[PDB]
Amino acid sequence: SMIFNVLTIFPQMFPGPLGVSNLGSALKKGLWTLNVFDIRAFANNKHNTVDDTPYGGGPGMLLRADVLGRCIDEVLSLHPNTKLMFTSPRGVSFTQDIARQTMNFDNITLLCGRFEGIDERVVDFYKLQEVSIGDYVLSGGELAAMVIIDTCVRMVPGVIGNAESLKQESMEGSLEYPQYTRPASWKGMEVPEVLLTGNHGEIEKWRRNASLSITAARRPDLL
Amino acid sequence: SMIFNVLTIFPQMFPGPLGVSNLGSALKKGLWTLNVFDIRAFANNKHNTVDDTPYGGGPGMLLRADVLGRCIDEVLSLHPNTKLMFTSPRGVSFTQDIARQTMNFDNITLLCGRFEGIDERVVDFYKLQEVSIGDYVLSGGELAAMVIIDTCVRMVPGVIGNAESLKQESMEGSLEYPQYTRPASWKGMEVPEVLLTGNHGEIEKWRRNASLSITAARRPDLL
Ligand SMILES: Nc1ncnc2c1ncn2[C@@H]1O[C@H](CSCC[C@H](N)C(=O)O)[C@@H](O)[C@H]1O
Ligand SMILES: Nc1ncnc2c1ncn2[C@@H]1O[C@H](CSCC[C@H](N)C(=O)O)[C@@H](O)[C@H]1O
Ligand SMILES: [Cl-]
Numbered sequence: 073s074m075i076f077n078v079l080t081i082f083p084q085m086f087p088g089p090l091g092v093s094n095l096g097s098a099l100k101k102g103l104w105t106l107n108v109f110d111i112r113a114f115a116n117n118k119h120n121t122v123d124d125t126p127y128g129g130g131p132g133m134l135l136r137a138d139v140l141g142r143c144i145d146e147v148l149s150l151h152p153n154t155k156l157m158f159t160s161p162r163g164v165s166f167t168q169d170i171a172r173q174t175m176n177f178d179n180i181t182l183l184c185g186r187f188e189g190i191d192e193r194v195v196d197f198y199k200l201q202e203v204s205i206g207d208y209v210l211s212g213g214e215l216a217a218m219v220i221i222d223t224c225v226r227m228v229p230g231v232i233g234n235a236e237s238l239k240q241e242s243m244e245g246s247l248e249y250p251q252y253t254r255p256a257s258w259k260g261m262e263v264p265e266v267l268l269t270g271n272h273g274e275i276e277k278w279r280r281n282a283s284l285s286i287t288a289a290r291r292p293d294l295l
Numbered sequence: 296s297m298i299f300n301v302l303t304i305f306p307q308m309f310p311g312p313l314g315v316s317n318l319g320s321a322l323k324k325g326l327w328t329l330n331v332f333d334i335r336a337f338a339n340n341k342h343n344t345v346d347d348t349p350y351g352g353g354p355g356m357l358l359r360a361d362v363l364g365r366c367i368d369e370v371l372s373l374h375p376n377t378k379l380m381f382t383s384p385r386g387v388s389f390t391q392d393i394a395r396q397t398m399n400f401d402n403i404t405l406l407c408g409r410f411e412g413i414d415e416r417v418v419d420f421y422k423l424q425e426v427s428i429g430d431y432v433l434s435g436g437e438l439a440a441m442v443i444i445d446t447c448v449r450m451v452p453g454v455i456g457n458a459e460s461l462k463q464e465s466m467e468g469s470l471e472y473p474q475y476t477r478p479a480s481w482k483g484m485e486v487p488e489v490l491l492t493g494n495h496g497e498i499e500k501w502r503r504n505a506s507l508s509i510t511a512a513r514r515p516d517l518l
């Protein structure tokens with residue numbers, strides 16, 4: 073019920089990080105599905121060439137519209153209502169919220185850029201939704217796609233523990249409070265005593281106030 | 296001259312995306328170095344256990360300070376001036392700028408969180424610099440570390456073509472203009488004529504104004 077199609081010239085990168093731990097076992101269980109399309113296999117030319125120099129001059133290469141179009145058209149023949157997305161620094165900033173909106177579609181397609189990007193006609197023709205994972209420049213869209221997929225699949229019911237998932241949701245808009253586990257003492261540093269009292273009321277008070285204080289100090293924008 | 300130490304419970308994920316294309320060949324050439332430390336190998340216990348339930352209650356698990364400390368101390372014995380960083384949603388927002396500051400150190404260590412995070416004592420004792428790659432929740436720090444490394448290594452001289460690199464720098468603070476390559480016509484859509492005239496002056500004017508218009512429409516914050 074959660075299908076992601078990844079379009080990439082590096083299919084052997086995938087599943088990669090998406091293949092371990094909860095994501096990976098949820099993938100084996102079939103709680104989500106990952107289809108990785110190799111863009112190169114859709115190159116009709118005798119060259120097998122996916123990229124070419126840009127019209128107008130300037131350095132680098134650009135993914136071609138004909139190759140991309142064949143690949144995307146294949147994806148559309150298989151999944152005609154897929155939500156078409158393009159990893160791009162030029163796109164809207166990915167957030168937990170965009171992640172949730174993205175999941176209201178149950179079939180999502182992520183095009184991974186390489187080189188200097190893709191021919192603009194592909195973006196306009198297919199109305200690709202451009203998405204940036206942040207204000208930094210990656211070498212390719214593959215990491216961005218993995219980031220988007222991990223974020224989304226983490227919220228598919230059954231992928232992570234229910235309690236963890238509910239706690240994560242309820243903490244949204246706040247920074248995580250300090251957390252501790254064994255050993256009791258480490259390099260002479262001890263765990264705050266309240267957390268060792270079993271006093272649920274006081275522990276929860278302490279956590280709320282720590283989160284509140286940390287949030288105001290570092291992410292006041294989260295109000 | 297650019298050394299990254301990645302601390303992770305999933306060493307087999309790496310190099311992964313960092314191992315392909317320019318990053319990968321620069322890694323083989325030795326323009327940067329990647330040391331992936333397996334946190335599990337530093338678990339002294341008979342259990343081989345890196346994580347444990349948090350003091351004070353609440354769901355999930357947390358990476359232990361004793362295990363992390365042994366691993367990080369090993370890293371410090373080898374690289375005593377390494378810049379210690381921790382992937383965390385609670386951290387400062389990674390940007391091209393933080394990436395450049397990060398590169399003024401030539402030895403960087405990235406701790407990858409898993410589960411609910413790590414024992415806070417580790418953050419305070421080692422003064423870890425917390426870094427978020429965006430306002431979304433990943434399953435682990437590994438993708439964040441890859442994102443940080445890719446961003447940084449992309450600016451190491453010799454990793455990508457000089458011309459591309461200079462163009463990227465000069466376009467900072469602006470959104471990328473529309474780009475085109477062959478074929479001339481695709482699904483009845485043609486390339487803007489100015490880009491086919493060879494007129495460098497007019498092409499550059501057109502690009503500047505497209506970038507300016509797109510930036511104002513979507514990222515006015517980039518002034
Ligand atoms: N922050 C980011 N978010 C999402 N995708 C990104 C990204 N940074 C790079 N990419 C991906 O990596 C590819 C190559 S980078 C493109 C560089 C180009 N000079 C430009 O400024 O746009 C992009 O096409 C895109 O798919
Ligand atoms: N946006 C982000 N940037 C950097 N690291 C992130 C991240 N999202 C998750 N992580 C990493 O993934 C690990 C597990 S997620 C931790 C979840 C916890 N409830 C919390 O809110 O902090 C984190 O310890 C961190 O290393
Ligand atoms: Cl591949």
Ligand SMILES: [Cl-]
Nearest residue numbers: 151152153154
């Ligand atoms: Cl569909």
Ligand SMILES: [Cl-]
Nearest residue numbers: 305306307308
């Ligand atoms: Cl592993």
Ligand SMILES: [Cl-]
Nearest residue numbers: 374375376377
């Ligand atoms: Cl050092």
